[PDB]
Design a protein around this ligand. Structure first.
Ligand SMILES: CC(C)CCC[C@@H](C)[C@H]1CC[C@H]2[C@@H]3CC=C4C[C@@H](O)CC[C@]4(C)[C@H]3CC[C@]12C
Ligand SMILES: CC(C)CCC[C@@H](C)[C@H]1CC[C@H]2[C@@H]3CC=C4C[C@@H](O)CC[C@]4(C)[C@H]3CC[C@]12C
Ligand SMILES: CC(C)CCC[C@@H](C)[C@H]1CC[C@H]2[C@@H]3CC=C4C[C@@H](O)CC[C@]4(C)[C@H]3CC[C@]12C
Ligand SMILES: CC(C)CCC[C@@H](C)[C@H]1CC[C@H]2[C@@H]3CC=C4C[C@@H](O)CC[C@]4(C)[C@H]3CC[C@]12C
Ligand SMILES: CC(C)CCC[C@@H](C)[C@H]1CC[C@H]2[C@@H]3CC=C4C[C@@H](O)CC[C@]4(C)[C@H]3CC[C@]12C
Lengths: 45, 266, 328, 219
């Protein structure tokens, strides 16, 4: 298990953080939890 | 005189403690009622708390009347209304106390049958009987005042009307519940004192609580109902009625602490 | 041995902290969530829940003797299937919604077909072979299922054939939870040995392991992107791990919190991390700045489980009482 | 609710609540018990003979009372990860063999460690514990050829049955720190089959009495 675990492709943590931030901001406008949903059109009301 | 003075701090010492205990107990009782599977215990306790609250709400009306050296400065109709409410609340409280005793006895005498046959409907019909026997029977307050002061200076017909009905009031509304409570508490004490496997501390605590409750029931509603037969024997209205009412008012203040603060809260 | 080389590679890869990178963005403001709908049909403690693909029907499992499917829009119940065993700690919803799987202390999580010609729900399949209590078995696909048990092994079964198609072993402690990646090719599995592992069902063997927790990881999740995930343990800490970095990224801990984690879920965009607790409180941590965006305290005993709809329009939490709440 | 589909939805709904209430009404009358033991004592060979995969469920009836016993034998995982499920059970029957003091799995002390954990568990701070000291017949044979000082270095008594049996029971009855809230019902399983049933029924009856008195305010 250790032999295959050691031989893996490990990217820089900065690139992973940048990708995570880009994914978070790209879908930020599509999150009803972040942006306050209007009372209308809301199924739960 | 000294009697009115004693009335002042007696009613004050009842007043300043009756309300908070009932107020804190009411929320717990309604929460337990709203909780799933409500036992008949909760219904009777809630009814008793409501009766105590009704009794306490009428305390200032009599307090202001008795403050002015036993002088009536209020309309006759409203005085009769408060008197009827007070007496009905007292009788409802004593009948609910009687109902609790038989329910407590059955919980220990036959716990297996009591566990698998419980239903809240049995706790509502028994409670409703107390309301029916309180409101329905306590009509003599209305008829006497409107026949032909506040329960004093009775005339010939006023005295001849209240005496023969006070015996019925003491007999069918106090004597039978008192006997039922005494028998049930004696049976519960006898059963608890001889049990197969119980804790000594729990057994002694239960026996002491039962004895305390029996003593409370036998000294709070005792003299007030005895005064009915005393007046019938003397063919006149007893003068020792206000103190009997004061003694009967102890239950309305000490019931929530007896039924709630029994080792639950230090 | 190889552990030293792996640690050295991980140290070399880490050059910048996530807090330093993400400090430029504005912090997420305080958010308040209110209980729009409440479910009181249950009569005992519930231990698991799941959300359907349509984000309208949600399943819940308790010890009252049955599991119930609720229509969140109208609060009405459409199915209440009794259970052979009262002890149930896991319930799952198929992606198509045709089947529902649930299991508990018995080493069997069974699947019932919700949609039937006669209109009555019937037991479709019972899977046996595990040597421990089922922790969390999830519907990988309408044809294959994934099971996690307390015997430190995980399994992948075929519903039609009813046998262990694949077996995953290597965990030291008891496995507590698993989460499926969106592509349905990778998944994570956290055990009681303060460790988590990554497995692909296509090959049948582990890919990489992650450690750092000081307690038993009882909750796991997966980022919507699929390149990262989150874990929650009894040490009152939540740890974010990255697949491409093989190391921790953020730790969500506070001095006030002493109780452990009961459930962990991610929002639609992965910006909010909803973590349950044993103090009947749910915390909406910031997935990028580790900031408490909000606290939900609508429960009584402790938040047993929580989940987020597919569209992320609401968050539904179930506690140790017979209460189910839906916020936003 | 005006629509026919909505009306059918609410019909099925309140049908479901009616069925749930009917099912849950009998749950209160149900009596649930847990079974526990250490090592070979985990299998309740003396309680699973009444003749009347992980969790094993045993069903029986006595005095018009339904008893359902849950036994954990194949659950070899950590107890703390699933012991919270058995919260609210009427009673716990913990069985430790009296003949396990001499031979080394030593395992008599392991029974005390297991008994300590369940008795002092935060989830079992209210449920009573029933203790059965089974294998009493084998205890007499082993008390003659071997002494009680091997497993009890602090023993300060003779080898009499009354003293030896009480000595083992006394240490098992003092392991509960919550004496006010928890009661331990000790018993020795007799050869007669009826005697074992009565003690379990009597112990459950006391628990029922405590529950009934708790509602009345006598707790
Ligand atoms: C004053 C009101 C509240 C009375 C309450 C009594 C209610 C709770 C009902 C519910 C279950 C009932 C019991 C069911 C079966 C039996 C066995 C019988 O051999 C004696 C009575 C006994 C033990 C019943 C006594 C009354 C009872 C306890
Ligand atoms: C008189 C006021 C204070 C209380 C009114 C109810 C009293 C009289 C009590 C005393 C005897 C009681 C009953 C004793 C035995 C049973 C059978 C059981 O299967 C249901 C309850 C039932 C039917 C009890 C109902 C309530 C009960 C009728
Ligand atoms: C507080 C005041 C007003 C009331 C005092 C009465 C109670 C608390 C006292 C007076 C008599 C006492 C009991 C006298 C004899 C025994 C037998 C023993 O094996 C257990 C305790 C027990 C059963 C006592 C319990 C408490 C007790 C009931
Ligand atoms: C508490 C219960 C069990 C016992 C009740 C007995 C006592 C409280 C009752 C019954 C007999 C009553 C007395 C009967 C006659 C008189 C004379 C009168 O001019 C004043 C009151 C007085 C002195 C009564 C005071 C209270 C009284 C003593
Ligand atoms: C627990 C506390 C609040 C009890 C309050 C009630 C007390 C203070 C009141 C109510 C009834 C009162 C008594 C009524 C009649 C008499 C006879 C008289 O010749 C002396 C006073 C005496 C004996 C009173 C003493 C005080 C008294 C006992």
């Amino acid at each position: 298990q250790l032999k295959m675990e050691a031989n893996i492709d490990r990217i820089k943590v900065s690139k992973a953080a940048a990708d995570l931030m880009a994914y978070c901001e790209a879908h930020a406008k599509e999150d009803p939890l972040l942006t306050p949903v209007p009372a209308s059109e809301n199924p739960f009301r | 005189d000294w009697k009115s003075s004693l009335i002042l701090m007696a009613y004050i010492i009842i007043f300043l403690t009756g309300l908070p205990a009932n107020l804190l107990a009411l929320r717990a009782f309604v929460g337990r009622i709203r909780q799933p599977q409500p036992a008949p215990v909760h219904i009777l306790l809630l009814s008793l708390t409501l009766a105590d609250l009704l009794l306490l709400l009428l305390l200032p009306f009599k307090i202001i009347e008795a403050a002015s050296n036993f002088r009536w400065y209020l309309p006759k109709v409203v005085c009769a209304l408060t008197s009827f409410g007070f007496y009905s609340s007292i009788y409802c409280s004593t009948w609910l106390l009687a109902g609790i005793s038989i329910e407590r006895y059955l919980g220990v005498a036959f716990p297996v049958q009591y566990k698998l046959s419980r239903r809240p409907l049995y706790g509502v019909i028994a409670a409703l009987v107390a309301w029916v026997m309180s409101f329905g029977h306590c009509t003599i307050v209305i008829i006497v005042q409107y026949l032909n002061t506040c329960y004093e200076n009775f005339t010939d017909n006023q005295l001849d009307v209240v005496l023969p009905v006070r015996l019925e009031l003491c007999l069918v509304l106090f004597f039978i519940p008192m006997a039922v409570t005494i028998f049930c508490y004696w049976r519960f004490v006898w059963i608890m004192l001889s049990q197969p496997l119980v804790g000594a501390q729990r057994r002694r605590r239960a026996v002491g609580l039962a004895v305390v409750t029996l003593l409370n029931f036998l000294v709070c509603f005792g003299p007030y109902n005895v005064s009915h037969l005393v007046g019938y024997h003397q063919r006149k209205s007893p003068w020792w009625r206000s103190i009997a009412v004061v003694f009967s008012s102890l239950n309305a203040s000490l019931d929530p602490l007896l039924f709630y603060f029994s080792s639950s809260v230090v | 041995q190889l552990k030293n080389q792996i640690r050295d590679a991980r140290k070399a890869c880490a050059d910048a902290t996530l807090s330093q990178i993400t400090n430029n963005i504005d912090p997420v403001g305080r958010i308040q969530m209110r209980t729009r709908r409440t479910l009181r049909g249950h009569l005992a403690k519930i231990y698991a829940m799941h959300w359907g693909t349509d984000s309208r029907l949600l399943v819940s499992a308790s010890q009252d003797g049955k599991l119930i499917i609720w229509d969140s829009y109208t609060t009405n119940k459409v199915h209440a299937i009794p259970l052979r065993s009262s002890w149930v700690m896991t319930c799952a919803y198929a992606p198509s919604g045709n089947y529902v799987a649930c299991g508990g202390l018995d080493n069997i999580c069974s699947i019932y077909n919700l949609k039937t010609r006669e209109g009555n729900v019937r037991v479709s399949r019972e899977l046996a072979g595990h040597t421990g209590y089922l922790s969390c078995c999830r519907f990988l696909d309408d044809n294959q299922i994934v099971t996690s048990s307390g015997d430190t092994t995980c399994a992948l079964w075929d519903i039609e054939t009813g046998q262990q198609t694949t077996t995953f072993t290597g965990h030291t402690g008891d496995v507590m939870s698993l989460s499926l990646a969106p592509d349905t090719r990778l998944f994570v599995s956290g055990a009681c040995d303060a460790s988590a592992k990554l497995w692909d069902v296509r090959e049948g063997m582990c890919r990489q392991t992650f450690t750092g927790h000081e307690s038993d990881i009882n909750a796991i999740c997966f980022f919507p992107n699929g390149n990262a995930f989150a874990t929650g343990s009894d040490d009152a800490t939540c740890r974010l791990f990255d697949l491409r970095a093989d190391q921790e990224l953020m730790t969500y801990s506070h001095d006030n919190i002493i109780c452990g984690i009961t459930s962990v879920s991610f929002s639609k965009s992965g910006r909010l991390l909803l973590a349950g607790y044993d103090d009947f409180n749910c915390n909406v941590w910031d997935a990028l700045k580790a900031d408490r965006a909000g606290v939900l305290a609508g429960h009584d005993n402790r938040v047993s489980c929580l989940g987020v709809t597919d569209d992320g329009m609401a968050v539904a939490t179930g506690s140790w009482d017979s209460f189910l709440k839906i916020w936003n | 609710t005006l629509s026919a589909e909505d009306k059918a939805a609410v019909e099925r709904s309140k049908m479901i609540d009616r069925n749930l209430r009917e099912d849950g009404e009998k749950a209160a009358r149900e009596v649930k018990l847990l079974l526990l033991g250490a090592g070979e004592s985990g299998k309740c060979t003396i309680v699973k003979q009444m003749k009347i995969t992980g969790i094993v469920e045993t069903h029986f009836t006595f005095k018009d009372l339904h008893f359902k016993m849950f036994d954990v034998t194949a659950q070899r995982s950590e107890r703390k990860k699933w012991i919270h499920c058995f919260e609210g059970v009427t009673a716990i029957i913990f069985c430790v063999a009296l003949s396990d003091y001499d031979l080394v799995l030593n395992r008599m002390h392991a029974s005390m460690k297991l008994f300590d954990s369940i008795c002092n568990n935060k989830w079992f701070t209210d449920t009573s514990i029933i203790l059965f000291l089974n294998k009493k017949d084998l205890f007499e044979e082993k008390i003659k050829k071997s002494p009680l000082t091997i497993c009890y270095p602090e023993y300060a008594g003779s080898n009499t049955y009354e003293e030896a049996a009480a000595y083992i029971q006394c240490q098992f009855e003092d392991l509960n720190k919550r004496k006010d809230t928890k009661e331990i019902y000790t018993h020795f399983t007799c050869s007669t089959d009826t005697k074992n049933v009565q003690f379990v029924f009597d112990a459950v009856t006391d628990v029922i009495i405590k529950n009934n008195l708790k509602d009345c305010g006598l707790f």
